[PDB]
């Protein structure tokens, strides 16, 4: 109805159209800002910050991405699938400006960006304690969003 309400609905449609072609949205700084930082939003965003370029040989990022793929695939096929939760990734070499804004000097990091407000302490996944099995990522997502993604491989 309102100008801001209509823009929001269009923005969500744009993410749903992206969804038909991708399970994970690969973002540079412009897209990150437009779809994750900019208001308004009524959806949660999960983001994997990664550095997957071969020359860097970031083994952790590589393995973590394999799990994140399994997760986002599980989402895609879920009976719980909706327009209220999306998965994105930001690669260091493509979104360097994003890493700097977030004061990230390494990878990988998984974060939840809620529709309102900023990420809370628990909105950074505790990778160093837990590891990055898709099932553990899913547990964390459930805790932060109440969306329960049941992993399959």
């Amino acid at each position: 109805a309102s100008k801001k309400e209509n823009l929001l609905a269009e923005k969500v449609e744009q993410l749903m159209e992206w969804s038909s072609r991708r399970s994970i949205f690969r973002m540079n700084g412009d897209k990150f800002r437009k779809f994750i930082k900019a208001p308004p939003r009524n959806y949660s965003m999960i983001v994997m910050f990664t550095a997957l370029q071969p020359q860097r040989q970031c083994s952790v990022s590589r393995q973590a991405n394999e799990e994140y793929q399994i997760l986002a695939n599980s989402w895609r096929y879920s009976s719980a699938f909706s327009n209220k939760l999306f998965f994105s990734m930001v690669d260091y070499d493509e979104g360097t400006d994003v890493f700097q804004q977030l004061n990230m000097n390494s990878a990988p990091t998984f974060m939840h960006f809620p529709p309102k407000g900023r990420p809370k302490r628990a909105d950074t996944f505790d990778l160093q304690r837990i590891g990055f099995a898709a099932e553990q990522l899913a547990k964390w997502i459930a805790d932060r969003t109440d969306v329960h993604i049941r992993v399959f491989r």
């Binding site: 550095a51 860097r56 990022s61 493509e94 890493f99 990878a107 990988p108």
Partner: peptide, 9 residues
């Protein structure tokens, strides 16, 4: 190495 250090893009 065993850590992914990121300096410049």
């Amino acid at each position: 190495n065993y850590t992914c250090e990121l300096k410049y893009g």
